Amino acid sequence: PKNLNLWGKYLRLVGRGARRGFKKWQVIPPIPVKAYGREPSAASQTGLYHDEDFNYHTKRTFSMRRTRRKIKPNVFRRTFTSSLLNVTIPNVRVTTSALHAMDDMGGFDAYILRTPPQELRSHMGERMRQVMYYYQDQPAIRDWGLPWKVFLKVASRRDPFYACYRHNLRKQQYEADLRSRVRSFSPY
Amino acid sequence: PPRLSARYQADVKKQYLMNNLPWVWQKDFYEGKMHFGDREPLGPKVWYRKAFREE
Amino acid sequence: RAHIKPYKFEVLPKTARPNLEMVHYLEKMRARGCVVKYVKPQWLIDEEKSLKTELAEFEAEALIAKGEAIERGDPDLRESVDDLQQRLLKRFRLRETRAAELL
Amino acid sequence: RSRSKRLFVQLKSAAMTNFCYVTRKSPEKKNFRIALRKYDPGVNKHVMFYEARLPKKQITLSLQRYIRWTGKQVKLLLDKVEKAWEYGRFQKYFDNQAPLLTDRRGRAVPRYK
Amino acid sequence: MDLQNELSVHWRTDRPPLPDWTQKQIQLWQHQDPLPEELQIWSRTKDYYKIHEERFLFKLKLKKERAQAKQEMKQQRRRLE
RNA sequence: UGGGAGCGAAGAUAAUCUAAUAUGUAACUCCGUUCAUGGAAAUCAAAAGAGCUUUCACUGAUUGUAUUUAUGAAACGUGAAAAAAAAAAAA
RNA sequence: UUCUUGGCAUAACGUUGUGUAGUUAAA
RNA sequence: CGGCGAGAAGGGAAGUGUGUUUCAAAGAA
Numbered sequence: 001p002k003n004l005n006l007w008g009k010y011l012r013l014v015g016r017g018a019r020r021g022f023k024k025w026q027v028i029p030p031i032p033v034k035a036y037g038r039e040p041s042a043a044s045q046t047g048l049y050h051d052e053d054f055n056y057h058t059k060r061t062f063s064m065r066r067t068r069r070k071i072k073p074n075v076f077r078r079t080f081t082s083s084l085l086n087v088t089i090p091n092v093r094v095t096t097s098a099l100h101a102m103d104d105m106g107g108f109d110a111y112i113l114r115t116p117p118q119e120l121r122s123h124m125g126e127r128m129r130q131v132m133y134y135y136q137d138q139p140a141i142r143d144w145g146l147p148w149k150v151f152l153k154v155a156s157r158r159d160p161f162y163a164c165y166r167h168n169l170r171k172q173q174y175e176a177d178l179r180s181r182v183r184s185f186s187p188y
Numbered sequence: 189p190p191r192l193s194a195r196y197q198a199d200v201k202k203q204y205l206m207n208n209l210p211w212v213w214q215k216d217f218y219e220g221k222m223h224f225g226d227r228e229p230l231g232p233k234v235w236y237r238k239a240f241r242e243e
Numbered sequence: 244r245a246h247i248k249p250y251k252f253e254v255l256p257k258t259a260r261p262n263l264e265m266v267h268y269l270e271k272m273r274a275r276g277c278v279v280k281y282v283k284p285q286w287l288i289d290e291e292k293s294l295k296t297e298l299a300e301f302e303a304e305a306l307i308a309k310g311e312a313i314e315r316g317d318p319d320l321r322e323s324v325d326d327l328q329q330r331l332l333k334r335f336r337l338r339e340t341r342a343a344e345l346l
Numbered sequence: 347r348s349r350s351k352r353l354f355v356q357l358k359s360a361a362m363t364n365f366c367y368v369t370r371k372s373p374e375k376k377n378f379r380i381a382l383r384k385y386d387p388g389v390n391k392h393v394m395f396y397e398a399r400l401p402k403k404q405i406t407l408s409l410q411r412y413i414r415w416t417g418k419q420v421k422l423l424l425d426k427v428e429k430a431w432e433y434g435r436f437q438k439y440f441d442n443q444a445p446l447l448t449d450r451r452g453r454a455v456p457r458y459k
Numbered sequence: 460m461d462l463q464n465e466l467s468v469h470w471r472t473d474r475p476p477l478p479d480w481t482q483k484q485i486q487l488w489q490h491q492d493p494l495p496e497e498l499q500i501w502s503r504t505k506d507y508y509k510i511h512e513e514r515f516l517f518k519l520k521l522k523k524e525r526a527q528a529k530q531e532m533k534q535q536r537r538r539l540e
Numbered sequence: 541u542g543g544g545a546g547c548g549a550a551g552a553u554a555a556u557c558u559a560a561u562a563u564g565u566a567a568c569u570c571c572g573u574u575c576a577u578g579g580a581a582a583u584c585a586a587a588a589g590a591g592c593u594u595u596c597a598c599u600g601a602u603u604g605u606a607u608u609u610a611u612g613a614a615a616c617g618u619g620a621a622a623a624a625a626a627a628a629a630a631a
Numbered sequence: 632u633u634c635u636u637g638g639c640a641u642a643a644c645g646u647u648g649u650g651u652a653g654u655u656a657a658a
Numbered sequence: 659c660g661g662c663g664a665g666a667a668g669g670g671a672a673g674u675g676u677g678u679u680u681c682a683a684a685g686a687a
Binding site for chain 6: 508
């Protein structure tokens with residue numbers, strides 16, 4: 001039938017009733033999310049899980065029993081150096097599938113820049129691409145080397161000076177607090 | 189791919205048939221074709237098994 | 244459908260070729276004596292061209308062996324080659340049936 | 347259940363007509379070959395019938411359902427399918443019980459093969 | 460025809476060849492590969508279709524076997540030449 | 541809203557029990573309904589031929605899944621309603 | 632008008648299903 | 659008193675014998 005790349009080969013040319021009454025516990029192994037048409041998850045939207053997301057599976061024994069259980073994906077913590085952003089991005093939740101595709105694309109900046117949104121399946125990568133184009137447009141601000149998350153919002157891009165000012169202010173405040181905190185408990 | 193699909197080309201073929209022109213825009217018009225019905229069938233296997241047994 | 248309801252079709256269809264089963268059924272009814280009208284394939288003609296000669300060859304033996312090596316009677320009253328071949332083929336194709344005893 | 351100790355023998359025709367008979371004998375005469383002269387419809391004649399030296403994981407409903415559902419250990423069924431295929435079967439012409447493996451949509455219309 | 464050919468030049472002229480991997484990569488940008496049949500098997504509805512059918516699997520096995528025989532005919536020409 | 545997506549148990553039937561039906565039903569979250577859904581063939585058919593999608597009737601409670609209890613608007617096909625390949629190089 | 636015969640069992644074989652075996656040159 | 663611009667991808671599916679049929683994963687109310 002049509003759309004062979006997608007799951008459901010034996011479901012298109014059938015009765016409406018079959019389709020409506022199709023059950024989910026009839027499938028033992030998992031199915032890819034891209035093929036299955038499952039909606040993205042919040043944890044995936046906040047990371048780079050290229051072909052990975054929460055799935056489900058079912059069991060079966062000799063006694064004709066059946067159950068369903070949840071399974072989590074495989075995620076790793078790493079660090080990536082972005083030349084265009086001119087700032088390190090510590091603690092990036094990634095997966096082997098995304099890592100592999102980075103190799104193919106050429107790196108971390110080119111992977112984000114030359115990946116279609118439907119294949120990327122990540123809003124954080126779209127925000128990073130936006131920030132990269134903003135830096136492209138505005139070299140001057142690029143020199144500051146501030147975290148990429150500072151200019152994430154559109155209002156921060158519209159008012160960049162204020163963003164850096166507020167970031168420094170709040171950092172100052174936090175360090176001030178910390179100092180006192182420590183001095184209170186100082187042994188000597 | 190062509191502008192016009194085979195689906196739509198079948199309508200032009202039907203119009204040609206209605207106008208009495210059989211078909212000219214064909215992949216192979218001037219080349220003979222051997223019909224599938226002219227093939228020599230082998231028949232079932234039980235016949236040959238029984239024959240061999242009888243032998 | 245086309246034949247029974249010609250008015251239902253703007254352009255009439257074309258007759259399709261039969262399969263093995265239908266060819267066997269038509270040839271079986273031909274022996275019964277129904278006038279069968281259908282296009283014959285090439286594999287049957289090719290095989291029959293040799294089968295008729297084989298059956299003729301076998302028949303001749305029985306004739307000559309006995310002593311009747313030469314035909315008699317009026318030339319305009321004897322059978323023809325086509326009729327003899329058809330009769331021999333029909334006899335051959337009915338050896339495994341009870342109709343042979345009636346011959 | 348029956349407690350009979352009698353052995354089961356198998357007599358086969360000498361004509362290679364696939365004709366067989368069923369009988370019984372005493373257990374003491376273990377090393378004794380039986381030979382008779384019975385009617386054989388395969389040749390319409392009286393032929394000899396000789397005793398033949400006739401000698402596995404069995405498949406159950408449960409097993410079948412398990413296999414069919416889970417898909418584990420399908421080779422057991424595939425061996426029978428291969429045997430059937432090898433033997434005269436699945437013929438397009440002159441067949442009603444199982445003319446074809448499956449339909450165009452992948453279904454087994456003949457309940458009894 | 461002349462006019463058309465002028466405007467329809469190729470994109471790989473006076474260029475070195477490409478690996479099959481690269482070719483595949485290129486392909487991917489336009490067209491996607493089919494889904495494995497192993498996974499597709501599961502799609503069968505239990506209402507009207509048997510999940511795991513021995514005859515159905517045997518048919519696919521025979522098709523896979525016939526594929527190699529088909530490929531050998533094409534491959535023989537290179538050796539002949 | 542018995543529409544669509546995620547997850548989704550039990551009372552009950554099998555005169556206890558497993559599968560199975562109930563039912564992908566109830567609760568929870570989200571889309572907010574003809575300006576919708578869907579979609580212009582690497583389809584179906586087999587040696588003829590039909591020609592995007594969608595609604596109704598018949599084929600037919602036929603085929604199929606099950607069995608100790610049920611479930612099933614199946615596919616091809618026919619009739620009928622509504623009919624839709626693309627406005628298009630720019631000024 | 633043909634002279635006989637489809638065992639033996641005063642305790643007689645476990646029905647149905649599965650498996651195995653057997654059948655389809657037809658409307 | 660009808661005579662070689664005689665072509666249209668070399669790829670998918672169908673019986674597993676395919677000289678056979680169909681189609682093009684890739685466009686808008």
